[PDB]
Design a protein around this ligand. Structure first.
Ligand SMILES: Nc1nc2c(ncn2[C@@H]2O[C@H](COP(=O)(O)OP(=O)(O)OP(=O)(O)O)[C@@H](O)[C@H]2O)c(=O)[nH]1
Ligand SMILES: Nc1nc2c(ncn2[C@@H]2O[C@H](COP(=O)(O)OP(=O)(O)OP(=O)(O)O)[C@@H](O)[C@H]2O)c(=O)[nH]1
Ligand SMILES: Nc1nc2c(ncn2[C@@H]2O[C@H](COP(=O)(O)OP(=O)(O)OP(=O)(O)O)[C@@H](O)[C@H]2O)c(=O)[nH]1
Ligand SMILES: Nc1nc2c(ncn2[C@@H]2O[C@H](COP(=O)(O)OP(=O)(O)OP(=O)(O)O)[C@@H](O)[C@H]2O)c(=O)[nH]1
Ligand SMILES: [Mg+2]
Ligand SMILES: [Mg+2]
Ligand SMILES: [Mg+2]
Ligand SMILES: [Mg+2]
Lengths: 429, 432, 429, 432
């Protein structure tokens, strides 16, 4: 029960989903042909939450892959771990938005939204009990942002009761892969604060930093970053698919991490992170993982938490451990970081423990921080957009695709309102 | 699924297309007989047999060049349907190629274009190759581009225009042809690529150590540029890019769409070793003004937008590091109102050396498309020349007797001044 | 418990630490791979005080290796007994101070001090109870002196309660390996008397003398001197890692040997010292070791104690023995050297006995003398500096690196004050 | 991680570099083709293949020498990018090489320098090799050193200057070139090494028993000196040393940075036996004035600073004993205000004999760098010559017509007098 439907938009979303479903299949011991050959009944007891068992004991991922270009879908169908997908799921157009949010939300999206919603409704009726949706996309490409916003709007208009998760790759401050990404980022963020339950902002800057420094890799490819994000997601949901002395679900996290409906943006963090040689030079201690999770260099969002305060903190542990040890860690870390938390929330740590490790290691930990520093990030983006809107550069594309300047005005206004709210609540005593 | 068609006006266009289709055949492993002892679906259609034909269109008024193409090695490859020929060339007279002679076959060319379009489903755009000096070039380009823009409302349209060199000229009335054709194409061209023969001469002589280069080598270089531009469509990459992405990322304003192209690496075969060809190294080679293919030093202007297409085994992390370092430099300065002026594309297919060529095979290559304000200066020079050759009303009588008005010259000059003014005005910074 | 964190600065410090950790591993029977294959539970009971046990029963040295040049670290990683180090510990820059104390304390040190302090804090939190720090470095090289002073300053500002040990190779009077070492020696000594608890001045002159004469070796290499100093250090700390009929720790020594906070500079001495042939020609008697420890030729500091008086004397013995015998030795030696001790301190001998010998012999002894003769040494250095400051030779390097002449003036003033205090307290009745 | 680049001005510089890079290749086991059938990272960069290239720069105005290098055995090793050539040599005229001709390629040399610097990360310093007699030497050295010091604020800069012999001259206007280039380099050179041909002639004739030595042998000796200087960086030792250590230990005052070099042992192959080559023995050989490579007897001055680099299997104890004994001597006298004037460095790598050479392989070697006050006397002699050749205003007209002022000569002479005065004044003892 409590099945979760996976949706992927944007090229980055598709690559992340490919690696993520690879990870999931490996965890449940599912071959690329889709047949289970594992040895632990635990995997099969909750396999339904992510898979569907077709006859002859075949298993298919409950996933949807969406784009507007055939290249990425063709690549996915080409490589291994692509056969198990239902071949009818690959919805794709022919043009590709081309970093034009208006195209990805007005013209092209209006063509494939019908098929997307049809497949979504089919999947919804196919499952027993719907828990929520998790979305994968970008915020720079027009495809990702535009179509993701459109689908989120339609779905929320169709399911006001379900919980919605989004893993949006926020563009990095220093490095920008595009030229016009501030516009679409602003519009997509507007729609997200409109109709989303939680957003896991992630930057390629922070991921590159972690891969280069912590993992000691001079050549980080997209595969490595996608693998990291996949591990993060699997750690997030594993409290559902496995027993634990203190389990959590998406609803519990949503209640714990969202004090007020607007402030629902998080940052993730994973531990441990060890190189190929630097692994047997350390004891795997709950204190070690705890201290690894809390530091500037290990945050997947390019924003120093020291510049702000933590509104809420959640932690999910995997592998056997004693609760008392974790409790001691939490109390010690809250004692030493007394200046790093909001005062009006006592005991702002939400703990949860599973009983299965991330295959190959003895224990692991995932940290989800809802802090206030992230607003700084937003600030910068607005400034970028601000400059790029003062001269109205590149405006004519969106203008001729139906959008108007009032749209950008309202989007910037809403973003500034959100930043003001975040700053004000940081200053709350 | 994603098709893009080619048009070649004048001898320059035809030779450039010879080089281009030669290169494409070498890429997809295509015999001169359409056999290959999907990828090619973009540019090649397939007959019932295993033979493929290129979606190409050749047009000229002098039949000599087309006859050479027919008698050339690439005879069996082309479809003799498209090799349109005339009787008398425009003869460096825009009036002939735009009012008198071009009318004779404009309908035929349009018909061939429409027939090719109807058999394609993923029509992307048009690659027009044409010089500016030749009257065929200017006149037929103006006519055909007007017709196509009239027909198809919004589809990609790319030109590879051979801008006349500042000092090294071949014709005499080049300013007239250039001014008229630019005034025409300013309203229809989605995105035009300036290329000059003098810059390529300099590049080949200094960097490839070829003391006496022929037109063949310049055609090789331009074919390399075009192949690198389309490699994102024709293949898969860690981060692909389409032409609509280019037009969205390089056109801040509807009129300013005149970038220039640069390519790297370019080293002699004997110099294949003696350097490791770093991604940062090739980045520096690209951004060095001695390698830009238009006679304009970018240090006199600001890069309004830049795009980099890498092909071969590249890694985005080091690419991003090199780009960030480039941004930290001073002389490479952009507009204040643009915070980031870089677009990045990556393809897994390395370029392939042309057999019988002059370059050396590499594992990584990079094409740069830059839309800056330095190029504006170039226009002024031509106007200068035009003004002198228009002050004495020299050579005007040919055009007058061919059905053209002096007011056309005056209005074209005014429009050129307006474009230059817009370029300079955008070149300024913003208030507060 | 009472774990001790080891820090090494300077090339000499790194070589000494290499040999010292080799000695420690041999004593505890720890293979270069880091696994224990010994046979005495005593080694394992206190192994934690110097090692950390990572999982799969691996042991890593709790050491930090610091420099600014990659050559020494590369050498350490190259040779054996280097694998067991935690590969992340090797903090090193790219330039090397180059005998410029200003560089090693203002420019270069400011770049790596962050990483050094981060690793130090990590180690501190990793251990249960911190006893103190022991430092290894030089006083001639700019790297050693400058960075050691910087680290000592920062650490003492972070831990005013812990005890600090330094083993500073003081430049020899006759032989000088550099040209400008008086300046950096003066500055480093200033900072040491500022913020250190005990300093074990050692000279290559005295070590060469001992190796050539006592050990009868015509070719003493740096390896031999480093081995001697390593044996001295292990003998100093072995009263902590092993039981004994009368044990001592660093705190006891600090209390015993420091009558006044400024006078906290010692000299070491080791016994026995026998050649390869001259070993079975002598009885290993407590009187023999005692008389060996007390003579001019066997002091690792180039200063005759006869020229001064012993303020305090400490002695640590290893191997089984009777207390009464040692007591008789102490009383006899104090009786015969009545003119060699301060009058206002009766019973100025601090005895301690362990119960494990130093591998291969039957017993051994270590002597720690806090005397007054050492001031003479300082005198000479000042004179050197004095001359080299009269012409302000080589001053321009430090001047252009931010330091000023007032710094040298204050340093010489402070050194003269220290020497005056030492001389005055020698004359105290 | 620790890189240092080379520059060679004039024929002397080019030949010295030939010898030097020959020696380095022999050291790291490098074929003339960049293969080696880390250590080399300091001087050699590595291409994609197993081929390595030396971070070298060759510059001259006469193309004959560079052509000889290209046609020499070490053809494939170098990168033809750096072999910069001119058209007409400066011709022993500092004005030509510093105002007229050097401007033609100074930009090119600077560009190559910057490109090499950008691909290096542990840039240590510059090794400039150039004579003084040749106008190319003086002029281009002045120009290039000024440019580099302007560019990079504080980085190591080392010169190996071929000081003109006291009596054995080759040109006629050597005093002019020497005075001008010394006045220039006094402000930019971090540390310059005086070397004279006459001293090396004497050393080769007497000690190596070669009655008729060629320039090749002198180049071999200087290459040995340079290799021993850098062996501390290029390898590990019981006590290594860097160039910054040298400049800190040998420069008591900002102006006095003109040491001289000495090498040992130097014995004929037939005399390889008949002596055990003690560390004390080689120490005495070094300190013997008959082996110093500059025509100045140190007994007329005081050693202000001395540095000894030993390589091979050495032991610091006996080294220190030998040095202490040396200090006990009388004629070897230093300044009163300097208590200890010795720096010591040790490397485990013994030098390797040059195949086809004249020396014999040893297991221990020692290079000495001495900054004394005797060398001051040498300057006076040149001034002497200059004064005479300037009293009659001889040869001045060439420089005058090339864009130089007599006031430049006067001011250079004044600066030389000032430097000599400073040397002598420091040579005195201190009060009380
Ligand atoms: N973290 C991560 N981000 C990626 C990866 N690949 C691409 N991205 C980001 O995702 C964006 C890709 O653009 P999309 O959102 O997919 O847009 P599109 O599908 O190409 O369609 P158009 O917007 O019309 O170009 C880029 O801006 C990258 O910043 C990846 O492997 N990992
Ligand atoms: N890049 C490049 N340009 C060329 C080449 N050959 C000729 N050109 C340019 O193209 C122009 C050739 O004139 P065309 O445009 O073909 O004019 P045409 O076809 O002869 O017709 P008329 O104008 O009536 O003479 C010349 O001005 C050259 O500058 C070539 O091989 N490569
Ligand atoms: N006792 C002993 N002393 C040594 C040994 N090796 C070197 N030394 C001393 O340590 C000093 C080494 O200089 P460092 O303090 O390491 O300075 P550095 O690391 O080289 O950095 P720079 O000061 O910039 O050169 C020398 O002056 C020697 O006197 C050794 O093996 N044993
Ligand atoms: N050590 C050494 N010195 C040399 C050698 N060959 C020439 N020299 C010196 O170098 C000088 C050569 O002149 P350059 O500096 O090369 O001047 P140039 O390159 O000929 O240019 P012009 O000054 O215009 O003639 C001569 O004065 C010699 O004293 C050599 O093989 N070894
Ligand atoms: Mg796309
Ligand atoms: Mg023609
Ligand atoms: Mg050093
Ligand atoms: Mg010459």
């Amino acid at each position: 029960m409590r099945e979760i439907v996976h949706i992927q938009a944007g090229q980055c979303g598709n690559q992340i989903g490919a690696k993520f479903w690879e990870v999931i299949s490996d965890e449940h011991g599912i071959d690329p042909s889709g047949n289970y050959v594992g040895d632990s009944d635990l995997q099969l007891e909750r396999i339904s939450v992510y898979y569907n068992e077709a006859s002859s004991h075949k298993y298919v991922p409950r996933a949807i892959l969406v784009d507007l270009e055939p290249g990425t879908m063709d690549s996915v169908r080409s490589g291994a771990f692509g056969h198990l997908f239902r071949p009818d799921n690959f919805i794709f157009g022919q043009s590709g938005a081309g970093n034009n949010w208006a195209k990805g939300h007005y013209t092209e999206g209006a063509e494939l939204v019908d098929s997307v919603l049809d497949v979504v409704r089919k999947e919804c009726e196919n499952c027993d009990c719907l828990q929520g949706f998790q979305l994968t996309h970008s915020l720079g490409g027009g495809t990702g942002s535009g179509m993701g916003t459109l689908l989120i709007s339609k779905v929320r208009e169709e399911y006001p009761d379900r919980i919605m998760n989004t893993f949006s790759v926020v563009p990095s401050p220093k490095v920008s892969d595009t030229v016009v990404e501030p516009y679409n980022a602003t519009l997509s963020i507007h729609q997200l604060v409109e109709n989303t339950d939680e957003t896991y902002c992630i930057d390629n800057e922070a991921l590159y930093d972690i891969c280069f420094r912590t993992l000691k890799l001079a050549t980080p490819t997209y595969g490595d970053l996608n693998h990291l994000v996949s591990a993060t997601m699997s750690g997030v949901t594993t409290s559902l698919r496995f027993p634990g002395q203190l389990n959590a679900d998406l609803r519990k996290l949503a209640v714990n991490m969202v004090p007020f409906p607007r402030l629902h943006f998080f940052m993730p963090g994973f531990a441990p992170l060890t190189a190929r040689g630097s692994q047997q030079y350390r004891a795997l201690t709950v204190p070690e993982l705890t201290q690894q999770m809390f530091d500037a260099k290990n945050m997947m969002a390019a924003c120093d938490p020291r510049h702000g305060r933590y509104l809420t903190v959640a932690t999910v542990f995997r592998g056997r451990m004693s609760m008392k040890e974790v409790d001691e860690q939490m109390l010690a870390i809250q004692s030493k970081n007394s200046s790093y938390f909001v005062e009006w929330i006592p005991n702002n740590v939400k703990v949860a423990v599973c009983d299965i490790p991330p295959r190959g290691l003895k224990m692991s930990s995932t940290f989800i921080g809802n802090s206030t520093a992230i607003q700084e990030l937003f600030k910068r983006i607005s400034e970028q957009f601000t400059a790029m809107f003062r001269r109205k550069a590149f405006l004519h594309w969106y203008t001729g695709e139906g959008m108007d300047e009032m749209e950008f005005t309202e989007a910037e206004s809403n973003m500034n309102d959100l930043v003001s709210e975040y700053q004000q609540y940081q200053d709350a005593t | 699924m994603r098709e893009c068609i080619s048009i070649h006006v004048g001898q320059a266009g035809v030779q450039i297309g010879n080089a281009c289709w030669e290169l494409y055949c070498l890429e997809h492993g295509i015999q001169p007989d359409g056999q290959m002892p999907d990828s090619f679906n973009t540019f090649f259609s397939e007959t019932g047999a295993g033979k493929h034909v290129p979606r190409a269109v050749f047009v000229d008024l002098e039949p000599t060049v087309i006859d050479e193409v027919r008698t050339g090695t690439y005879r069996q490859l082309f479809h003799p349907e498209q090799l349109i020929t005339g009787k008398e060339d425009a003869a460096n007279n825009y009036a002939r190629g735009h009012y008198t002679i071009g009318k004779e076959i404009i309908d035929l060319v349009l018909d061939r274009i429409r027939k090719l379009a109807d058999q394609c489903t993923g029509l992307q755009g048009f690659l027009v190759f044409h010089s500016f000096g030749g009257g065929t070039g200017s006149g037929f380009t103006s006519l055909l581009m007007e017709r196509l823009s009239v027909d198809y409302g919004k589809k990609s349209k790319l030109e590879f225009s051979i801008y006349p060199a500042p000092q090294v000229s071949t014709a005499v009335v080049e300013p007239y042809n250039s001014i008229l054709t630019t005034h025409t194409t300013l309203e229809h061209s989605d995105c035009a690529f300036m290329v000059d023969n003098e810059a390529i001469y300099d590049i080949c002589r200094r960097n490839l150590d070829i003391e006496r280069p022929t037109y063949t080598n310049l055609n090789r270089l331009i074919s390399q540029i075009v192949s690198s531009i389309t490699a994102s469509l024709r293949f898969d990459g860690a981060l692909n890019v389409d032409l609509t992405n280019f037009q969205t990322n390089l056109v801040p304003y509807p009129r300013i769409h005149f970038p220039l192209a640069t390519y790297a690496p370019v080293i002699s075969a004997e110099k294949a070793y003696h350097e490791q060809l770093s991604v940062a190294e090739i980045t520096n080679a690209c951004f060095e003004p001695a390698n830009q293919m238009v006679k304009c030093d970018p240090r006199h202007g600001k890069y309004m937008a830049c795009c980099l297409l890498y092909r071969g085994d590249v890694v985005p992390k080091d690419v991003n590091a090199a780009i960030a370092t480039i941004k930290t430099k001073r002389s490479i300065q952009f507009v204040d109102w643009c915070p980031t002026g870089f677009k990045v594309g990556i393809n897994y297919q390395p370029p392939t050396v042309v057999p019988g060529g002059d370059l050396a095979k590499v594992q990584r290559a990079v094409c740069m498309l830059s839309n800056t304000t330095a190029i504006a200066e170039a226009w002024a020079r031509l106007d200068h020349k035009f003004d002198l050759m228009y002050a004495k009303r020299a050579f005007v009588h040919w055009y007058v007797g061919e059905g053209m008005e002096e007011g056309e010259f005056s209005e074209a000059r005014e429009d050129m001044a307006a474009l230059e003014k817009d370029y300079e005005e955008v070149g300024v910074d913003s208030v507060e």
